[PDB]
């Protein structure tokens, strides 16, 4: 929404995000990257926004020459809201209902997995690696990669789970090793809050 | 220099860092990390068919060319760091008359081509690099130019004299969040020699 605020997360980022983050990489992330999108997002607005949703916003922005500015920050508040909800100290279980969603569709979780880090590693320069349903292709999975800012509202696609590959969200814990940062972070996914989206998705 | 590609020989000694702005740790993980990995990724995507071409022959042979995005992306990246690294040395090298003339010229004072610079770099979204080249098109004029993820210059007729890498990998180490601190720091370790030496053979 507008004026705009950084969310309450799931978990203490003092503590960070165990086993896969350090206190220093959440509390970079979250109280210097996406606190300048939230003050950013607010100067850029101002008042003109009130009433609407970061969702609204985004999709009023996008592909608008004359707001990039407002996009890029309204984007990015959006997108890192999306991904601390996605991480858990120790992760929780996928539920039955979005193993049953992802089994179906790629075959296997496993096969899914190594489908997504493959996004994720060949996602050139800053971006993000989304699993999102699609409701103009019967509300089907797919694995969608998107540059900086790029949200996949913008597209009709339904987030499910994000994962950032800003060089920032992994340079603390893991230097160039995003490979090794996109295997690791399964350890942290918060699979029941990715199934309460997967679920609203489905209507 | 040419395919097959080669980590180029630095001025200096990256396992002392780059006094006073740069850390071992941070020289190590961009030059051995980042740049040979562009360095390999290239030599497998140019396979036979780039062999003793140039890296400027490479560059503009497959920008603007779809199929070939990847090549683009590897070719202009070891390019673009070659330039960077070149750029660099440890308490940096004053200012030739010949350049500070130029510089002052154009943008009224030292000073002030500094500050326009920092500015351009810090507002320059995502990954990317911010250059300082002259444009043959226009008197041989200095100009400020921004590029995104591994836009180069060179596809713009554009003739590169300094190049600073803002991909967050190249200050994350030693300045986490902080861009605006390493360019305003950067200054320091410029070989504004070499960029004369670029300045003067771009005419
Ligand atoms: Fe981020
Ligand atoms: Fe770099």
Redesign the interface.
């Given at each position: 929404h507008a004026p705009a605020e950084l969310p309450k997360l799931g978990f203490n980022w003092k503590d960070g995000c165990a086993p896969v983050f350090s206190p220093r990489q959440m509390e970079?992330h979250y109280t210097?990257?996406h606190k300048?999108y939230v003050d950013k997002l607010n100067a850029l607005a101002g008042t003109t926004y009130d009433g609407k949703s970061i969702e609204e916003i985004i999709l009023a922005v996008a592909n608008d020459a004359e707001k990039k500015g407002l996009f890029?920050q309204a984007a990015q508040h959006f997108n890192h809201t999306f991904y601390f909800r996605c991480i858990t100290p120790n992760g929780k279980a996928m539920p039955k209902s979005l193993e049953s969603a992802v089994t179906a569709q790629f075959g296997s979780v496993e096969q899914f997995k190594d489908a997504f880090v493959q996004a994720g590693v060949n996602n050139?320069?800053?971006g993000w690696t989304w699993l999102c349903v699609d409701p103009s292709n019967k509300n089907q999975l797919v694995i969608d990669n998107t540059?900086?800012?790029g949200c996949p509202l913008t597209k009709g696609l339904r987030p499910v789970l994000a994962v950032d590959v800003?060089?920032?969200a992994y340079?603390?814990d893991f230097?160039?090793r995003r490979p090794d940062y996109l295997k690791e972070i399964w350890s942290v996914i918060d699979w029941e809050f990715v199934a309460k989206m997967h679920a609203q998705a489905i209507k």
């Amino acid at each position: 929404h507008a004026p705009a605020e950084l969310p309450k997360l799931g978990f203490n980022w003092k503590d960070g995000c165990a086993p896969v983050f350090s206190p220093r990489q959440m509390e970079l992330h979250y109280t210097k990257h996406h606190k300048a999108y939230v003050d950013k997002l607010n100067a850029l607005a101002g008042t003109t926004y009130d009433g609407k949703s970061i969702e609204e916003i985004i999709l009023a922005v996008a592909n608008d020459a004359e707001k990039k500015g407002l996009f890029n920050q309204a984007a990015q508040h959006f997108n890192h809201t999306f991904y601390f909800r996605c991480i858990t100290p120790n992760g929780k279980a996928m539920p039955k209902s979005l193993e049953s969603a992802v089994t179906a569709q790629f075959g296997s979780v496993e096969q899914f997995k190594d489908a997504f880090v493959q996004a994720g590693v060949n996602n050139f320069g800053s971006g993000w690696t989304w699993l999102c349903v699609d409701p103009s292709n019967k509300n089907q999975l797919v694995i969608d990669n998107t540059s900086n800012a790029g949200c996949p509202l913008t597209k009709g696609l339904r987030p499910v789970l994000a994962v950032d590959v800003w060089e920032h969200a992994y340079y603390k814990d893991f230097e160039n090793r995003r490979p090794d940062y996109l295997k690791e972070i399964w350890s942290v996914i918060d699979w029941e809050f990715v199934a309460k989206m997967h679920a609203q998705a489905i209507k």
